[PDB]
Symmetry: C2
Subunit: 133 residues, 2 copies
């Protein structure tokens, strides 16, 4: 029968122009358009989208988290973590916008799990698909 499904987002203020420019300058490349669009709305935040707890980092913190978790080191330079759910990291590819899940405690290029072709697609899937399976 009918079931009430929720997606809740605890929205932060949006990212400033300077904050986005700073990270693009440091990366020496562009952020994926949809990820940037989300950040301009909510600069990080956290929520429960369907069954999925997702914690997204403020753009000012992304470089430091990526260094701490060793993302580029174990993956390659195109892959950047943007959030997490405990052991699980959420990663994007800077060029093709694809989204993956990884075990932050066992990072391996061969084991990254593709979940969506882009950021907005990810957000939409989340309402009806449990990424923990």
């Amino acid at each position: 029968g009918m079931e009430v499904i929720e997606s809740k987002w605890y929205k932060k203020d949006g990212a400033s122009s300077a904050s986005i420019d700073d990270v693009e300058k440091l990366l020496n490349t562009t952020l994926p358009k949809q990820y940037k669009s989300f950040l301009l709305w909510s600069n990080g935040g956290e929520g429960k989208l369907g069954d999925n707890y997702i914690y997204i980092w403020a753009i000012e913190d992304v470089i430091a988290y990526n260094h701490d978790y060793g993302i580029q080191k174990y993956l390659q330079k195109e892959y950047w973590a943007f959030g997490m759910d405990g052991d699980i990291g959420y990663i994007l590819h800077l060029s093709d916008n694809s989204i993956y899940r990884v075990d932050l405690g066992d990072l391996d290029i061969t084991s990254i799990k593709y979940i969506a072709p882009s950021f907005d697609d990810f957000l939409g899937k989340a309402i009806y698909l449990n990424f923990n399976k």
Copy 2:
């Protein structure tokens, strides 16, 4: 500062695969994969995703609704409505999976408005973009 954004989907029982196949047979075409995946989860339903009220049709009703609103008559055979919000129709393009908005009361190929490249992308956008702009 922080703001609680919700969304809710009033989920129906999933569509039978057979019921989806019946429509594909009748249309002599394949439906977009993401749309089918959503139907398998919820065979229509309605919700408020961000600021957006969205009412999605059960698969068994889609052909009759498309006929009644004259979607193919006014648009093209490649465009199929899957839902609405009052005057607004939500349409998919069979050839490339994209999602559009139209005014059901003023259907015209020249005035269809692109909103997303796929169904899941559309759902994700809805959480943070108000399509009534």
